[PDB]
Design a protein around this ligand. Structure first.
Ligand SMILES: Nc1ncnc2c1ncn2[C@@H]1O[C@H](COP(=O)(O)OP(=O)(O)O)[C@@H](O)[C@H]1O
Ligand SMILES: [Mg+2]
Lengths: 523, 98, 426, 78
């Protein structure tokens, strides 16, 4: 195919530069986000060449790979791998990128050993099957005795926020992340926790609101605070209805009848508001816009009117007040109203927001992130999003494993025990699978500046004879017990790091020909 | 001072409105009834007792027509147009209007 | 029936008219020396509307080319398919107009327009039912304003009841050719709102930025200028030249374009605008082409539709598509952007379609409709007319041929009355 | 043993004469027009039915209404 090429502007390579470009392009992705892994790793700042560059600092490996725009074909497999890891569990996107790159780096070492690439695939399938049994047998469940499960949930949020910008804020941001999912008391919808980013103040000034915050302040001549009110929301049109009959006009003979029709239009718009206040309410939230004619009617009756909050803002108010959407007002005995105590307006960062203090059945939260710059607020929002998504799945799957390098040495030990019970064809591929699992505590140990040649060697000697909870202590720089220090991760997060990296390395290693087509508008 | 968000102009609705003229005297019933329409709006304003009107800036239809401007000048009423929709919060808190 | 005789009068009218018949002869498959190369009644039925069939199968276009210049119309004599017209449809003029309105009416027009009316009479013999006439000219030209204004007045002595669809090339607000361009634009329009009913506005210099930015042309010229103008000319006369479900001829277009007969200045245009290399890398759907005509990137004149309000909207599509999606897409814009449309018209955007594809493009739509975009362009013409007439600059060029100082006074009073005519509903 | 019906008609609900304007004055007669547009199409389907023509062939398109009617009456169309 290179000799006597039958292509126009397209090129290809077979078994010489195919695996060469696949191993170079995938290691350079993994070596890029290598410095961001661990609780002592640095962060990246992403910039463009111009034309609203919109600089966005991120430490999470999914947000780095989704914005760099790699031109390598085999590197897009690892870029899409970190996107699925953020969409499923929301954590380990950096850990699954280095692990999939360390598998292909050990596969580059098997180039000169003349090992068949299908032997490495069949050797890694038996290695990944033994690695699933190491995490499944070491998972710690939590059913009853809930005072130890809430302590276990703070160890999950303490491990996730340690590898982010919120380093010296674990005394505050752990309570902001555990109690946010604990106030859901149900499914992890991940949209009732509305994060509001406001400039001014430090990250210690951020807090979790006991009620709910909103924008689009209360009318013009309406009351600003009503105590012991009944909140009724809506999703209906207020004025300029044009009610659902396309092709309907007002064909009259004189202009005196147009004055009678427009008075009949305002009488039906007034009668719609009169059906709303028969419930006995004091606040009104409409998803659509409220014009001036129903605004005067709510202001004359002493009723609030919040106009055009959000499409998903009426869903959070329905989960924090315990009511319903109620888009049709014709049955006051079948419409459930919300409950609150204070609807006072608070000022956060020279902006008046509507505080719904003292609400009943409040299965929704509002995190008020305050930072020094907008770059910190964009990073702390993604750092909190990577912490709330794991706790939303830890309450659904209570199985937890010991992180901090302890889980990877347990997975590498089960592969090494079965590497000695195999013939020599697939045993060399299983030894490279166990060395790549030991690189994940090696990257964490070397990012702090510790002796990674000795600490991982002490972890391999500890896990070889007992010590199932022995891991890497990044606080002092030694080997400690992970059950005492409280460094644990979720089982489903660590399983998706192991499983998705083994499936993505299976695709790139099986590629022997990269036939790229002719691009458009590139000359 | 009174803040008015109504448009003192010809009668029109949100729906499509048309006038059918099929008679000789029907053209007289269009112009003279439009003058009697806004005269009932000016005399409703004049009998209230206000001297300063603040009309909100309308985009869809005309807020203050030329026919409505002449009746308000004979009632000795100062009329101010083009008040923005984002400025009505500052006006109602300062003067005390609704 | 419903025959229309075409009159291409002026220097700019023959340049547009040379490529005006290139689109009709290619879409209908009419051979210039053979008989026809059609396929069905979509192309072969409407031949007799714009062509008169001779004995033997040869088709002759109903076209009259008027020019006060021998050298300009010789390109349409034996050039790009110019040998297909009648030999008496080549009325030359040995005396040039000189970009003067008074010279084309009283000096050149007193001896030629009796012979130009004879060519319309011979063309009307083969018309069993004359529908109307079209007139493509320019305001900044001598023959377009001389033999376009006097020709449109003498044609009403013989055809007082027939409709008229004039095509006017407006001058540009960006560049200027001569200082008598506000004089020629004011005098030609002053006798155009008198007894006509349709007039478009095409700016040629405003299309140089469209070809530079959208059509990707580095050095444009007059040949690349008239290519997309011919696509706009063929978009209006699409249902007139091809049958279909939405039957709307020029008689149905004269009523449903203007609620009032005086405010008959439209803004033509079409969509999409693709280059010679980026055309195949672009898909064309129904809401893609319908939403492109309302923006300012698809205007043939130097105007701004983002600060105006339309009155009547008509659109003709090219290709077999579902036309029920056109009305549902445009009705959603009339509720969110009601300050740009009419408040009492339930169906502002009209629908038209055919089953004949255009040349080059796969799908294509055209934009025909009036708005207040001509109001801001008529103020700049009367502003230049006010400063030149108050100093009485170059008035001896006009008053020496038969004009007077009271002629420009009445031409200034009614043209400023047209500014207040558009200022009511703005 | 089927019977084939060869048609040159539209089996859609939106069959319009392209110039019809149904001006109504009341809501009692407005609902009667919408019921008439379905009864025009359903009367054509009753002519295809009660004849044995289980296979329908037409050069003009058929909408979702007449497609689901033949599926309930165990008839094929194209
Ligand atoms: N307190 C701690 N002690 C030891 N290791 C830790 C601690 N906190 C975090 N880590 C390690 O740092 C790593 C951070 O990985 P991370 O970049 O969050 O992966 P992802 O990008 O997939 O979320 C984890 O694998 C975890 O083992
Ligand atoms: Mg993490």
């Amino acid at each position: 195919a290179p000799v006597n090429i039958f292509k126009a502007g397209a090129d290809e390579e077979r078994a010489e530069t195919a695996r060469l470009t696949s191993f170079i392009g995938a290691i350079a992705i993994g070596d890029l986000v290598k410095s961001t892994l661990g609780p002592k790793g640095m962060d990246k700042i992403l910039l463009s060449s111009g034309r609203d560059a919109s600089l966005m600092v991120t430490n999470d490996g999914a947000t780095i790979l989704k914005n760099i725009g790699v031109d390598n074909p085999a590197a897009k497999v690892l870029v899409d791998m970190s996107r699925v890891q953020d969409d499923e569990v929301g954590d380990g996107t950096t850990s699954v990128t280095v692990l999939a790159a360390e598998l292909l780096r050990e596969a580059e070492s098997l180039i000169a050993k003349k090992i068949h690439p299908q032997t490495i695939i069949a050797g890694w399938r038996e290695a990944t099957k033994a690695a699933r049994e190491a995490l499944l047998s070491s998972a710690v469940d939590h059913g009853s005795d809930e005072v130890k499960f809430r302590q276990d949930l703070m160890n999950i949020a303490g491990t996730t926020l340690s590898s982010k910008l919120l380093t010296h804020h674990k005394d505050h941001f752990t309570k902001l992340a555990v109690e946010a999912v604990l106030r859901l008391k149900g499914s992890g919808n991940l949209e009732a926790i509305h994060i509001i980013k406001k400039l001014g103040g430090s990250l210690a000034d951020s807090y979790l609101d006991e009620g709910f915050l909103l924008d689009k302040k209360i009318g013009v001549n309406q009351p600003k605070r009503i105590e012991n009110a009944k909140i009724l929301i809506a999703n209906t049109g207020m004025d300029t209805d044009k009610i659902k009959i396309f092709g309907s006009r007002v064909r009259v003979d004189s202009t005196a009848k147009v004055a009678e029709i427009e008075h009949a239009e305002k009488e039906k718009m007034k009668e719609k508001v009169e059906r709303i206040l028969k419930h006995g309410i004091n606040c009104f939230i409409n998803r659509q816009l409220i014009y001036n004619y129903p605004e005067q009617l709510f202001g004359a009756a002493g009723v609030m009117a919040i106009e055009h909050a959000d499409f998903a803002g009426v869903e959070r108010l329905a989960l924090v007040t315990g009511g319903e959407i109620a888009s049709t007002f014709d049955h006051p005995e079948l419409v459930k109203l919300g409950s609150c105590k204070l609807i006072e307006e608070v000022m956060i960062g020279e902006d008046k927001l509507i505080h719904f203090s003292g609400v009943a059945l409040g299965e929704a939260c509002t995190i008020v992130l305050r930072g020094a710059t907008q770059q910190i607020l964009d990073e702390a929002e993604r750092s909190l999003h990577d912490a709330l998504c794991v706790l939303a799945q830890t309450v659904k799957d209570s199985r937890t494993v010991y992180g901090g390098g302890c889980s990877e040495m347990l997975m590498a030990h089960a592969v090494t025990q079965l590497a000695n019970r195999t013939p020599g064809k697939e045993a060399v591929a299983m030894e490279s699978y166990a060395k790549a699992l030991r690189m994940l505590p090696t990257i964490i140990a070397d990012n702090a500046g510790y002796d990674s040649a000795d600490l991982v060697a002490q972890l391999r000697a500890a896990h070889s004879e007992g010590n199932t909870t022995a891991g890497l202590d990044m606080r002092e720089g030694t080997i400690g017990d992970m059950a005492i220090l409280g460094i644990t991760e979720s089982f489903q997060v660590k399983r998706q790091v192991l499983l998705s990296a083994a499936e993505a390395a299976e695709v790139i290693l099986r590629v022997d020909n990269i036939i790229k087509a002719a691009p458009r508008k590139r000359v | 001072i009174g803040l008015i968000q109504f448009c003192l102009s010809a009668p029109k609705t949100d729906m499509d409105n048309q006038i059918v003229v099929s008679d000789y005297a029907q053209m007289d019933r269009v112009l003279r009834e439009e003058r009697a329409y806004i005269l009932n709006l000016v005399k409703q304003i004049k009998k209230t007792g206000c001297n300063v009107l603040l009309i909100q800036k309308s985009i869809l239809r005309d807020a203050l027509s030329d026919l409505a401007l002449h009746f308000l000048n004979k009632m000795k009423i100062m009329v101010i147009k083009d008040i923005e929709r984002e400025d009505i919060e500052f006006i109602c808190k300062t003067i005390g209007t609704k | 029936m419903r025959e229309i005789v075409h009159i291409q009068a002026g220097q700019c009218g023959n340049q547009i008219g040379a490529k005006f018949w290139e689109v009709i002869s290619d879409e209908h498959g009419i051979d210039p020396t053979g008989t026809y190369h059609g396929d069905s009644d979509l192309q072969l039925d409407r031949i007799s509307v714009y062509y008169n069939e001779a004995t033997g199968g040869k088709y002759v276009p109903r076209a009259i080319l008027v020019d006060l210049e021998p050298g300009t119309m010789d390109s349409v004599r034996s050039g790009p398919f110019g040998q297909i017209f009648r030999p008496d449809n080549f009325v030359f003029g040995q005396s040039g107009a000189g970009n003067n309105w008074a010279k084309g009416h009283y000096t050149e027009g007193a001896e030629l327009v009796d012979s130009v009316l004879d060519v319309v009479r011979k063309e009307a013999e083969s018309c069993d039912c004359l529908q109307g006439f079209q007139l493509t000219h320019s305001l900044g030209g001598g023959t377009g304003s001389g033999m376009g204004t006097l020709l449109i007045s003498k044609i009403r002595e013989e055809y007082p009841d027939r409709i008229m669809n004039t095509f006017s090339v407006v001058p540009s607000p960006k560049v200027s050719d001569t200082v008598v361009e506000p004089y020629n634009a004011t005098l030609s329009v002053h006798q155009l709102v008198e007894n006509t009913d349709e007039t478009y506005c095409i700016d040629n210099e405003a299309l140089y930025d469209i070809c530079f930015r959208t059509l990707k042309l580095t050095t444009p010229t007059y040949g690349d200028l008239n290519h997309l103008v011919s696509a706009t000319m063929s978009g209006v006369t699409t249902c007139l030249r091809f049958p279909g479900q939405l039957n709307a001829d020029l008689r149905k277009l004269a009523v449903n374009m203007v609620p009032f007969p005086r405010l008959h200045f439209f803004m033509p245009g079409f969509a999409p605008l693709t280059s010679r290399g980026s055309q195949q890398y672009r898909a064309l759907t129904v809401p893609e082409l319908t939403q492109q005509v309302f923006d300012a990137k698809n205007m043939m004149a130097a105007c701004d539709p983002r600060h105006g309000r339309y009155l009547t909207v008509a659109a003709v599509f090219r290709g077999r598509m579902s036309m029920k999606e056109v009305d549902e897409q445009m009705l959603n814009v009339q509720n969110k952007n009601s300050s740009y449309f009419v408040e009492w018209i339930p169906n502002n955007v009209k629908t038209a379609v055919c089953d004949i594809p255009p040349r080059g493009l796969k799908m294509a739509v055209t934009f025909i409709g009036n708005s207040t975009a001509i109001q801001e362009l008529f103020k700049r013409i009367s502003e230049q007319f006010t400063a030149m007439f108050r100093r009485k600059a170059f008035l001896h060029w006009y008053t020496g041929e038969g004009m007077d100082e009271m002629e420009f006074t009445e031409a200034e009073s009614n043209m400023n009355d047209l500014v207040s005519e558009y200022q009511q509903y703005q | 043993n089927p019977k084939i019906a060869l048609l040159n008609v539209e089996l859609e609900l939106k069959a319009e004469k392209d110039n019809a304007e149904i001006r109504v004055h009341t809501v009692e007669d407005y609902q009667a027009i919408v019921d008439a547009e379905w009864n025009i199409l359903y009367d054509k389907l009753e002519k295809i039915h009660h004849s044995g023509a289980k296979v329908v062939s037409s050069k003009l398109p058929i909408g979702d209404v007449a497609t689901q009617y033949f599926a309930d009456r165990d008839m094929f169309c194209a």
